[PDB]
């Protein structure tokens, strides 16, 4: 069967042949309780202490239990279950090439990464998950240490020179939808530049930026509170047009115009934004080691090995023991071995032939410490570090939780209509909520004046 | 796109890597989550204690 | 009166997310229940449901 | 194809060098 199957594709041999031949069999969860399942065919049948000696079936491979997001995790059994679950949940938030035909799609909130490299160590399961063709991260030379102090409580230090060269530099799209319709007998919408004379309702923004058709042309500079579509509804006309959300500052990629099912002019516009990786952006590896970049140093300031190899990320050593993520260290070691050799390695969860000692022995055959530690130098003074730092390649991801999309402020912004209080939501330019727990804390502090100010003066004064 | 070669898919502004199996309503990808429930036509004998019955033969 | 969340928007942020969403389940039990027996990973979920992939919030 | 032949040669080599396997970081269950 193995020979006939290995020559598939070429002739016509497939899984249906195995099923019909009587080698495999579908056992459902209700029947699995009455069969003596076996893990591996060779190990659990040779001849030893008589355990059962009545196996009826045998699994294909133990690691097949994992799902989608868990399969891409290298060495999951070498890590504690909560961190595996955290990685599985964070994997879905990793950016990258989410679909090859992204330039044709007009979805809302699409992220794409420039140089999505492939993991240096790939499990045998992701070969079918299609991860290698559409990865979501870049292999960075990570050195677990506490260089300066900006990477102590779950934070990292990225290399400014690396970012300049395009390290984890991705893009941010934002599509829009807007079409004209017949509101009423006298009311009617139409695309037209709202001039300064006929249109009564109008915004205090620039309008000549777009062409006469009323649609901003592609590749034009835009910023927050800028008109993107020239819609004007006749009452003379009211500027019932949308504007770019505050704090976006992008560039228009392409403009599409068509007719909807009703037959009215329907158009879509998407604005791109080159998000340079800056401090505050959330990153994460394939083991649950989340974090946000604290500070970025140039190459001259970052440490370096015996040769010109400066670390690209520096996580906190203290995050390893409490979280028990030895899988991350194993991944780093195997990535170093693979890079020295020059071919992708195997990180299958259960393989019975991937331990630490053999990997270490392999790594010792290239002029590097068998445990992966290396001697660095202080990037400032140039003195060797007493402790031999642990530096090596490792596959890291980037989440969409940008700092620019979360930063918000307010200074007597718009007010609601029902209760004259600030709005809610970053997009609507609203204020934060002073929850009851904050009130209780302020009462505990006894700061009655501050409490009354927050609740009356800067909330909703009225006589 | 039933059993269509990758050539046409690429020519139709689509990719052969898309898993598919998702509806398109009003230009939005809708997916039906697989809901789970209790198997029908099977007898269950529970032992609810916070009630007047010692055993209950639900079916 | 009917259920909610049966048809969700397919999260097209990365291929892994699309794969996970297209093969996702959802139990009809009420959200944020005091009980803790249905949430716990049961022994029968061997090879059928991933024992690691799951949210970490109230669900 | 080269990866397939590489895997096959690695497997046959692993089968050949069956002299001794004394390693510290590995274990397996043995019930009863």
């Amino acid at each position: 069967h193995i020979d006939q199957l290995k020559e598939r594709e070429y002739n016509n041999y497939s899984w249906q042949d195995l099923v019909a031949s009587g080698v495999v069999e579908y056992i459902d969860t209700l029947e699995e309780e009455t069969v003596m399942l076996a893990m591996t065919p060779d190990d659990l049948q040779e001849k030893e202490v008589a355990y059962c000696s009545t196996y009826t079936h045998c699994e294909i491979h133990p690691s097949m239990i994992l799902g989608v997001c868990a399969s891409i995790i290298p060495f999951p059994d070498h890590n504690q279950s909560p961190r595996n679950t955290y990685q599985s949940a964070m994997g879905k938030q990793a950016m990258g090439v989410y679909i090859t035909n992204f330039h044709v799609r007009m979805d809302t909130l699409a992220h794409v990464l420039y140089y999505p490299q492939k993991p240096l160590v790939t499990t045998r399961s992701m070969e079918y998950l299609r991860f290698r063709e559409l990865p979501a991260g870049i292999n960075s030379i990570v050195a677990i240490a506490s260089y300066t102090g900006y990477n102590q409580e779950d934070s990292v230090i990225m290399n400014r020179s690396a970012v300049d060269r395009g390290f984890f530099r991705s893009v941010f799209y934002r599509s829009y939808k807007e079409q004209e319709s017949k509101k009423g007998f006298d009311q009617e919408e139409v695309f037209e530049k709202p001039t300064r004379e006929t249109c009564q309702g109008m915004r205090h923004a620039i309008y000549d930026k777009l062409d006469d058709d009323g649609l901003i042309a592609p590749g034009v500079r835009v910023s927050g509170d800028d008109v993107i579509i020239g819609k004007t509804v006749t009452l003379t006309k009211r500027d019932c047009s949308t504007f770019l959300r505050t704090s976006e500052t992008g560039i228009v990629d392409q403009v599409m115009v068509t007719l909807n099912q009703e037959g009215y002019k329907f158009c879509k516009i998407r604005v791109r934004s080159v998000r340079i990786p800056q401090i505050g952006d959330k990153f994460a590896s394939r083991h649950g080691q989340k974090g946000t970049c604290g500070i970025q140093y140039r190459q001259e300031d970052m440490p370096f090995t015996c040769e010109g190899i400066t670390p690209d990320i520096i996580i906190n050593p203290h995050a390893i023991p409490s979280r028990m993520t030895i899988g991350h260290l194993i991944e780093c070691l195997q990535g170093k071995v693979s890079a020295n050799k020059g071919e992708i390695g195997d990180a299958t969860p259960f393989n019975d032939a991937v331990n630490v000692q053999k990997i270490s022995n392999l790594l010792s055959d290239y002029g590097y410490h068998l445990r992966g530690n290396e001697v660095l130098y202080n990037g400032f003074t140039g003195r060797k570090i007493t402790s031999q730092i642990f530096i090596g390649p490792t596959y890291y991801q980037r989440l969409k939780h940008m700092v620019d999309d979360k930063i918000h402020s307010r200074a007597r912004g718009p007010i609601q209509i029902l209760n004259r209080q600030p709005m809610e939501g970053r997009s609507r330019d609203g204020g934060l909520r002073f929850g009851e727990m904050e009130r209780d804390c302020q009462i505990a502090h006894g700061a009655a004046q501050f409490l009354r100010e927050r609740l009356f003066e800067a909330s909703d004064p009225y006589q | 796109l039933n059993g269509l070669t990758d050539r046409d898919l690429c020519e139709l502004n689509e990719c052969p890597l898309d898993p598919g199996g998702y509806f398109i309503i009003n230009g939005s990808e809708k997916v039906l989550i697989a809901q789970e429930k209790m198997a029908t036509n099977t007898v269950y004998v529970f032992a609810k204690k916070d009630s007047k019955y010692a055993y209950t033969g639900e079916c | 009166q009917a259920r909610a969340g049966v048809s969700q928007v397919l999260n097209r942020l990365t291929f892994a997310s699309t794969l996970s969403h297209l093969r996702r389940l959802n139990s009809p039990i009420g959200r944020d229940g005091k009980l803790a027996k249905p949430r716990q990973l049961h022994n029968t979920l061997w090879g059928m449901v991933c024992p690691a992939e799951t949210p970490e919030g109230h669900a | 194809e080269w990866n397939i032949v590489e895997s096959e040669k690695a497997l046959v080599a692993e089968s050949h060098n069956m002299k001794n396997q004394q390693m510290d970081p590995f274990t397996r269950r043995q019930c009863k």
């Binding site: 193995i2 199957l5 290995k6 598939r8 594709e9 041999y13 497939s14 899984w15 249906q16 195995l18 495999v24 591996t40 065919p41 060779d42 294909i60 491979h61 097949m64 989608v68 045998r124 070969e127 079918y128 998950l129 393989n351 032939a353 | 898993p19 598919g20 199996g21 039906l32 697989a34 | 794969l19 297209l22 093969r23 | 895997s7 096959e8 497997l11 046959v12 692993e14 089968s15």
Partner: peptide, 28 residues
């Protein structure tokens, strides 16, 4: 003939065939 020892490689050929014949979202 049975496949002793040399089974790590033949263990994944079946998986490759299964995923080639049936897709990931084949159930839907």
């Amino acid at each position: 003939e049975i496949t002793p020892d040399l089974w790590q490689e033949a263990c994944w050929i079946v998986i490759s065939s299964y995923f080639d014949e049936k897709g990931l979202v084949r159930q839907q």
